[PDB]
């Protein structure tokens, strides 16, 4: 009954915590 | 306690009966509360069966323009979006939503600034799907759904999005748009893609809206601009690469 799953995503969006997603490719060496 | 009442079973039958306007609204309001306040097993009974019936009505109501139809129809679409929010609030509900042909498309069509409260709720659902570290980089598929919506409603795929961000609209709508804009851009690893979306929005006058929005002392607006500008700053140096 993890009925709250989208609710947690809304929190993450509002706080901007989710816009902290990057696996991190780079070509500079 | 539980008792004989409208189970998910009865709501499916009721939605498929061809209800409209106020009795449809009453069914949907009751359903939204039921989905939100019942266990996930109740949502499972509702899952493919009820979702299909909600979308059957939703698609029709998107084609049935409320200005030339019912005053209730705008609210009916919105209440379906609220039902979907309660439905997608879990595991298998998110799953069943991503297994529909038009579920994703209709959420985009529900981003209408004329019914501002519906667009707020719809943009939030799409944004939540976009940031999923699962399936497939769902943010990338949400973009496809806007491209489909673009030709179906004869608009630029990002035109309604900017149109929330609107000095003269409610702050929640404004931002409901900036939030989804960040949700489309950030999860993508491809640099040229991130700047392409950002530049596509700038063609549509986004650059002019950001300067209006930065003067606003809001909570979440400030949060969303800050993210948009920060990712923009990184991407500029990322494109520059070495020098």
From Swiss-Prot, chain A:
Residues 1-29 form the DAD domain. It is found in: Cell membrane; Cell projection, Ruffle membrane; Cytoplasm, Cytoskeleton; Cytoplasm, Cytoskeleton, Microtubule organizing center, Centrosome. Expressed in brain, heart, placenta, lung, kidney, pancreas, liver, skeletal muscle and cochlea. Expressed in platelets. It is linked to Deafness, autosomal dominant 1, with or without thrombocytopenia: A form of non-syndromic sensorineural hearing loss. Sensorineural deafness results from damage to the neural receptors of the inner ear, the nerve pathways to the brain, or the area of the brain that receives sound information. Patients may have mild thrombocytopenia and enlarged platelets, although most of DFNA1 affected individuals do not have significant bleeding tendencies. Seizures, cortical blindness, and microcephaly syndrome: A severe autosomal recessive neurodevelopmental disorder characterized by microcephaly, early-onset seizures, severely delayed psychomotor development, short stature, and cortical blindness. Homodimer. Interacts with the GTP-bound form of RHOA. Interacts with RHOC, PFY1, MAPRE1 and BAIAP2. Interacts with APC; acts as a scaffold protein for MAPRE1 and APC to stabilize microtubules and promote cell migration. Interacts with SCAI. Interacts with DCAF7, via FH2 domain. Interacts with NCDN. Interacts with OSBPL10, OSBPL2, VIM, TUBB and DYN1. Actin nucleation and elongation factor required for the assembly of F-actin structures, such as actin cables and stress fibers. Binds to the barbed end of the actin filament and slows down actin polymerization and depolymerization. Required for cytokinesis, and transcriptional activation of the serum response factor. DFR proteins couple Rho and Src tyrosine kinase during signaling and the regulation of actin dynamics. Functions as a scaffold protein for MAPRE1 and APC to stabilize microtubules and promote cell migration. Has neurite outgrowth promoting activity. The DAD domain regulates activation via by an autoinhibitory interaction with the GBD/FH3 domain. This autoinhibition is released upon competitive binding of an activated GTPase. The release of DAD allows the FH2 domain to then nucleate and elongate nonbranched actin filaments. Belongs to the formin homology family. Diaphanous subfamily. This is Protein diaphanous homolog 1. It comes from Homo sapiens.
